[PDB]
Structures are given as C-alpha cells and as structure tokens.
C-alpha cells in the first residue's frame, strides 16, 4: 500500500538511561498494528522488537526487551513511537520501523516479511 | 527457527552469478523472504515465500529452495548489487540470517 517511513536523528545515550525513536508513516492508510519494530546491531542481522497486536489492541514485545520496551502510535499524527530504557552498551544499533506484509494465510506462531522500512535511528550508547 | 547464511562474503566480478545460501535450523517450508541492504540504508524486501519476487525487482534477482535449503541467485552481477543480503522466515514468527557481503571486485 506504498507508504514512507520517516525516522528521527540518531542519538548518543549514556548507560542506564532510555531513548524514544519516532516514526512518521506518510502515505496511504496508517494502522499501528502493520508498523513494527526492530533494529540491527552492527556486523549482525536485523532483530524483531516489538508491535501493537490487532484486536488486543495492546502493545508486545519480545522477550530480549521486555520489562523495557514501550511502544505506542497516535493515529491521529499517522506517528510510531519506540522507547527502549535502562540502556546497555549492548543496545548500540539502528533501529527500524517496518511495516509489514499481509499474508495470504495467518497461522499458528506464523509472522511477517516487512516491506517498506524507515530509514533507520543509530543509538549509540556509551 | 535459526538462519545460518553462507558464504560470510562472496567477492564476484561485474556479470558473474551470485549463489547466496539460507540454511533453516527447523523446517520453514516456503515462509523465506530475501533482503538487500545497500550500506547505511534500510533493507529492501528482494524474494518473498521463497520464489516470488518483490514489486520493482529485476529478473536478475531470483529465489529458489523449501523446507531447509535456501538460494538467492543474483545472475549478471551489476556494480550497484554490491550489499549485504539476509534471509529472513516467517514460519516460527521473525527471524533474519547473518548476512552475506557481496563485494564487487
């Protein structure tokens, strides 16, 4: 449904403290439950954070950040908000908004292929 | 379900054919998705359940394999291809390969 992901600036974080990386959707039709979080630490693959699940309507995260991870949106502004807190050195990475693909089928622990991808946030922490 | 991609670098010349491998830990049947990510930017979605290619996607660029064993083949290897590719299944929820470096030498 060609949309574009639009990030905010990169940020250098010290220790123990939290980031909140935005993300605004322009184009066809904004829903919080196909934009979904991830991010890629440098020399590895991209990694799944988190979403805001549909009928539930509440936001889920993986393991890895839960206790830590916020997610929110505000369709109104057609915005998703990150907030990844207690920061490690570990957490230096880019992190993405995608949003996702729908499958002809949805089934038992079955996910998603991302389409379009914002730009990227490095998160830098000291 | 673990994605192990292969080769770590492919080093190819301008018109050569590029053979990525995607080795699935479980079986994922066609749920594969083929990514190119161009240095400092997002990845671009190349082959979806396996085969299918992407929206604006040259032939060049095609995706093979089901359950475990996976190929991405980049024929006619162009200068602008030179990225690092992932994997990524849908099967067992979300999860990407390591990467494969393309250089273009």
């Known amino acids: 449904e060609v949309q574009l992901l639009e990030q905010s600036g990169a940020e250098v974080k010290k220790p123990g403290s939290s980031v909140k990386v935005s993300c605004q959707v322009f184009?066809?039709?904004?829903?919080?439950?196909?934009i979904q979080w991830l991010r890629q630490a440098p020399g590895q693959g991209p990694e799944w954070m988190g979403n805001?699940?549909?009928?539930?309507?509440?936001?889920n995260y993986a393991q890895k950040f839960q206790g830590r991870l916020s997610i929110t949106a505000d369709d109104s502004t057609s915005t998703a908000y990150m907030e990844l807190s207690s920061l490690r050195s570990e957490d230096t990475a880019v992190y993405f908004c995608?949003?996702?693909?729908?499958?002809?089928?949805?089934?038992?622990?079955?996910?998603?292929?991302?389409?379009?991808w914002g730009q990227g946030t490095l998160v830098t922490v000291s | 379900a673990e994605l192990t991609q292969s080769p770590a670098t492919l080093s190819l010349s301008p018109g050569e054919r590029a053979t990525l491998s995607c080795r699935a830990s479980?079986?994922?049947?066609?749920?594969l998705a083929w990514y190119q990510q161009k240095p400092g930017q997002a990845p671009r979605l190349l082959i979806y359940?396996?085969?299918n290619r992407a929206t604006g996607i040259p032939a060049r660029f095609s995706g093979s394999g089901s359950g475990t064993d996976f190929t991405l083949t980049i024929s006619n290897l162009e200068p602008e291809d030179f990225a690092v590719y992932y994997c990524?299944?849908?099967?067992?929820?979300?999860?990407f390969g390591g990467g494969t470096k393309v250089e273009i030498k």
């Open positions: 184009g066809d039709t904004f829903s919080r439950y196909t």
């Open positions: 359940d396996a085969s």
């Open positions: 805001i699940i549909p009928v539930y309507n509440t936001p």
């Open positions: 995608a949003r996702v693909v729908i499958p002809n089928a949805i089934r038992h622990t079955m996910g998603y292929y991302f389409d379009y």
């Open positions: 479980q079986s994922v049947n066609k749920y």
């Open positions: 990524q299944q849908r099967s067992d929820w979300v999860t």
